[PDB]
Enzyme design. Structure first.
Site, short mmCIF file in Angstrom:
data_model
loop_
_atom_site.label_atom_id
_atom_site.label_comp_id
_atom_site.label_asym_id
_atom_site.label_seq_id
_atom_site.Cartn_x
_atom_site.Cartn_y
_atom_site.Cartn_z
N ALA A 238 -6.10 9.43 -10.85
CA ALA A 238 -4.91 8.62 -10.76
C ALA A 238 -5.25 7.12 -10.84
O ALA A 238 -6.42 6.74 -10.80
CB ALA A 238 -4.19 8.92 -9.48
N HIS A 239 -4.21 6.30 -10.96
CA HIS A 239 -4.35 4.85 -11.08
C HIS A 239 -5.20 4.27 -9.95
O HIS A 239 -5.11 4.70 -8.79
CB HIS A 239 -2.97 4.17 -11.11
CG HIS A 239 -2.21 4.33 -9.83
ND1 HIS A 239 -2.35 3.47 -8.77
CD2 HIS A 239 -1.33 5.29 -9.44
CE1 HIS A 239 -1.58 3.87 -7.77
NE2 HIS A 239 -0.96 4.98 -8.15
N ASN A 240 -6.07 3.33 -10.33
CA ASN A 240 -6.89 2.57 -9.39
C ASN A 240 -7.86 3.39 -8.61
O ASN A 240 -8.26 2.99 -7.52
CB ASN A 240 -6.04 1.76 -8.41
CG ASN A 240 -5.07 0.86 -9.12
OD1 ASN A 240 -3.95 1.28 -9.44
ND2 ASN A 240 -5.50 -0.37 -9.41
#
EC number: 2.3.1.191
Lengths: 350, 346, 348
Positions: A238-240
């Site tokens: 997922a993001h980041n």
């Protein structure tokens, strides 16, 4: 094409025994190996299959060789498995093809090495870079400002977007999406306001990523995979998310947004890790582990119930559904106390 | 990059401005990496220390959180910084204004394509397909016969939309997802499985997001339905005839088995598994990796799993679990009751 | 456009016809969706509401249920309307009529493609490849070198076939799926991982169905194998050297690790995980999210999981579960026994 025994022994710095001029078509398992095949024996567990094997020559340890006297040809090494690993690349089907197929659609502002292969129906955007000896297999697409270094392999149906930066020797397999819009939604009006994800992805050297994976770009900043990370098929990053160097992520793991996993972690298959957590260096996770809070110290962690026969399992989950009613500890402490007032009274009246 | 006056930005989020509203900003950015010309946000007391150390020029915050940022000059005050930020991210987004039909696109003469739609390289579009106004269909993607895509939709590369699926407006579907594929319809008989061909479709409402590597199967005859505002993350399985009510969120790697109804405003965390022919009530939340095998008739937060144990502790715990069945678990508060009763007299 | 006569349709299902056997039908449809050019069916009395008001031109029915449908004219009478529907689905299942090779395909001249095969747009096909009679390869797919596909196969778009995988007959591979790709082979040395090139391949038997977004890896040595009649749902991981026996069913999101053998006729529910180097016997059923880490040698039914709890009740239960290891649950009845012992052996 074939390779001589002595040429292979040399590649693994291993001691040759027998005739080195022996030629092999391939490496093979102890069961299906013919005399034109080299095989390996990883510790005494393989001895029997080795003994009755029809392989021409045998990668073994010194100790194992002594137990294999009906055989003539060996490479002797400390780690038979690692030696095997090294040799596979000798017999691996390599791509030597060079240049760009005319079905491809590349922006003129792109920089593409002369030693790179751009497959059929590949689409490449603005200010993209593709380094020396990198392969971009057919149908794949690079969005604007995507960089790929040298000696990479990118298989077909791969979407690289969000301006992702790929270092060197990166291997990305098919149907994988790199740097696509992450899962950012703000709750309001009982509806969901989409958040446009404005960061990128940074993948380090020597990373392998499987097929059907999704490595989302950062909401702001970056999704980072450090050097030597390995990722199996069907994984979500997922993001980041930030994964420390040399970590191994097995198939079907999911790691939610803003999560940091340290260097040299080993996550087994189908593990899930919640958002915004920190997982220390040298953490191991067995199968189907779900992680909801920080792991602050190195070690092996698990979750799950293991397997039960169906009747046993049903009996057990009822017993669980009853568990919060049964005062466990309290019951044990009330015993201790009863034990106490027995102990005393038995000695007091004596 | 294009700049915006801080007062414009505050107005766009209907917030309160504190500081010089004519200061211009070039981007949003994180507490960690933000620079003097960036705007950031703080959501909860948990990001205050980071904010304090931030180089950001202006802070989207809450009245309360503002109290704790004395050393900071420029603010936008809002009830919900997350949302405010959400609204502003689109202002700083790389906005795709492209229109037309790439030369490599194969489009059947019966398809209707809005002149304000974009169709990427190597797209395939079947008979009687409609692509609506302002819709982007990225390269290599295919739209089989009778598929319809509304307005302001985004469809990325390597997408399959088959099963004559209909898509409404503002629908967002990410790379290598399959929409309308043949579901898992197999009949058991005498140790063989027999394929049943699937003849329904997929209806996707307005404002639905679907991530990459998803599989939204068509219904057997009737439809798989995703109501308006449903949001679905990456690697999700939605089986045949599954019905998901409005605004329900489905996090990465969930699997919903066929013919299951899911209510309005449900929230499922990552890697949940919900079996077939089940009903789930509106306003149900499921925590990560939860399994559902029965109907859930009441609103609320539900959960399955052991939680995490250190491995060695874990092992001794499953030794105990395997034992649970043999212990007369409820009979023993009763036996203690009896034991204490014969000390009572003594 | 494509039509079939009522009487042809009754024949296929071995059904009996009331009404005009020359009427033609475009589709099967639901009672609620069906139009005059569509055939529908009724199983059981419940749906006679929808039936009565359905616009369908014909009704697959039982003889008992037909009586509750006086205003209707055209029927196929049968024992099991649903089973008859099932048979006819394939007749109305949109099949690729076209045949031959699209000009946009790129095929190595050493490939051998049947004239009755359809090879779609932008398909790439490598050296020594084979594509059997009547086999559909939909647009954008690629077969890498030495790959073979049998007869009557369906192979959808955005599929990778590599590791010179061999496919027998009537194999269906759904979109965005990867067959015979490099497995997860890594030798550990001093912290790092040495990649292991994957030298074997994949054998896919006849009548195998594989879903979308699946990965079936090639063998390290030898072959990953799917025996005839195996069905695999979407989003499934089959690791290197996995061997799956006759007519085993593998539900969505399942993961099977390297070198595991799964018997004939096994059934695996959603989101199961099977560890590597294991054997699982013929006729083993695994319920949702099962965790297999040892051989399963007796046929039967196995399971993992806590059950679903309301969140707060959940928290209370895990706290309890956490203390379970520091509890002599085994001795509790013998402790209660012993405690009541020296209670009885006190009076004198």
């Amino acid at each position: 094409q074939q390779y001589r025994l002595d040429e292979l022994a040399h590649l693994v710095k291993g001691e040759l025994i027998g005739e080195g001029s022996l030629q092999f078509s391939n490496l093979a398992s102890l069961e299906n190996a013919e005399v034109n095949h080299l095989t390996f024996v990883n510790g005494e567990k393989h001895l029997d299959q080795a003994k009755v094997s029809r392989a021409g020559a045998y990668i073994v340890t010194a100790a194992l060789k002594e137990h294999l006297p009906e055989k003539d040809n060996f490479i002797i090494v400390d780690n038979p498995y690692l030696a095997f690993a090294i040799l596979t690349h000798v017999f691996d089907k390599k791509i030597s093809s060079t240049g760009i197929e005319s079905t491809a659609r590349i922006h003129p502002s792109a920089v593409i090495s002369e030693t790179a292969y751009i497959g059929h129906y590949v689409v490449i955007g603005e200010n993209c870079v593709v380094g020396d000896n990198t392969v971009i297999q057919s149908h794949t697409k690079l969005d604007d400002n995507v960089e790929v270094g040298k000696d990479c392999f990118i298989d077909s149906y791969v979407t690289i977007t969000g301006s992702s930066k790929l270092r060197d020797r990166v291997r990305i397999h098919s149907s994988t999406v790199i740097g696509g819009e992450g899962f950012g939604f703000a709750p309001y009006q009982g509806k969901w306001h989409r958040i446009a994800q404005l960061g990128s992805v940074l993948i380090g050297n020597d990373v392998r990523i499987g097929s059907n994976c999704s490595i989302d770009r950062g909401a702001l900043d970056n999704t980072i995979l450090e050097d030597g990370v390995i990722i199996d098929n069907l994984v979500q990053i997922a993001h980041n998310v930030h994964i420390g160097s040399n970590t191994a992520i097995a198939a079907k793991c999911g790691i939610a947004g803003s999560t940091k996993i340290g260097k040299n972690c080993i996550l087994a298959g189908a593990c899930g890790v919640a958002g915004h957590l920190s997982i220390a260096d040298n953490v191991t996770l067995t199968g189907m582990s779900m992680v909801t809070k920080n792991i602050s110290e190195a070690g092996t962690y698990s979750s799950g119930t293991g397997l039960f026969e169906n009747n046993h399992w049903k009996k057990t989950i009822v017993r669980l559904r009853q568990l919060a009613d049964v005062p466990l500890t309290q019951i044990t402490k009330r015993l201790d106390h009863i034990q106490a007032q027995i102990e005393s009274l038995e000695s007091t009246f004596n």
